[PDB]
Amino acid sequence: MEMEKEFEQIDKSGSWAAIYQDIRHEASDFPSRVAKLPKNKNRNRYRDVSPFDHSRIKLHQEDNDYINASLIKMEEAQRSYILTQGPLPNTVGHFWEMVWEQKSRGVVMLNRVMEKGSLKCAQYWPQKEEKEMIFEDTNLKLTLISEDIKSYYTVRQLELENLTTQETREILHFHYTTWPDFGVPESPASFLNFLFKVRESGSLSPEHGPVVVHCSAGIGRSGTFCLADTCLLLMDKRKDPSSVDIKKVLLEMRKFRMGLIQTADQLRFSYLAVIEGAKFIMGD
């Protein structure tokens, strides 16, 4: 069924909360035993959001390999993503270790450091060129190279240096700064504009490691981003674009991280973004 007609059907019958609960009921349940070990309690921002064991990213260190992060590998679309929580004061060094070890080119941040008067993640990148950051636990240095502030998002060029070997890499930081404190955006236009800027940079392409995407818990706004990207790519690849089933794609992604898309409003917004984004992938 054309999602656009599916959309109006659900909208006129006001059944979004019902569709969404059906997804929650059918979603995969896999063990997350490593996340729950006592030694890792201060590595998790939220007690009820954990990576599954089978898909978790392992840090390359004998001490403790745990980070709250998951590899979402989409086989038909030929795209991979790493979804992670916003880094905590004691996990910022682990976060940049993962970026280095997984050979990522881009980091996508979908939250502000403070929202609703509370801290939603650590200030984990430098704000001034001349004030670089050193992460002593993982032996990495991080420098701000340039900053381009736009109305709906900011793009930063960063230099990550492995102090052990003195190799350096350019990392691109894509910061969507205008998601509202409550609810979802009224129009998907600025979100789609942002997605296409990430695509244009190379950060999603198979020559690099997977993009790292986060919000506060790494499941809500973050799920919306990868769900929309993968659905649009499938519509590009297939002979029959109306065969793309957004609910089935979401359940496939939930095999790799729990709780992706956190509200029925985020589900509706994901439909809106794919429907409106389609009106480019087909030529215009």
From Swiss-Prot:
Catalytic residue positions: 215 (phosphocysteine intermediate)
Tissues expressing this chain: Expressed in keratinocytes (at protein level).
Post-translational events: Oxidized on Cys-215; the Cys-SOH formed in response to redox signaling reacts with the alpha-amido of the following residue to form a sulfenamide cross-link, triggering a conformational change that inhibits substrate binding and activity. The active site can be restored by reduction. Ser-50 is the major site of phosphorylation as compared to Ser-242 and Ser-243. Activated by phosphorylation at Ser-50.
Record's keyword annotation contains Repeat: no
Chain positions found as Phosphoserine: 50, 242-243
Subunit structure: Interacts with EPHA3 (phosphorylated); dephosphorylates EPHA3 and may regulate its trafficking and function. Interacts with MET. Interacts with NCK1.
Protein name: Tyrosine-protein phosphatase non-receptor type 1
Organism: Homo sapiens
Full-protein residues shown: 1 to 284 of 435
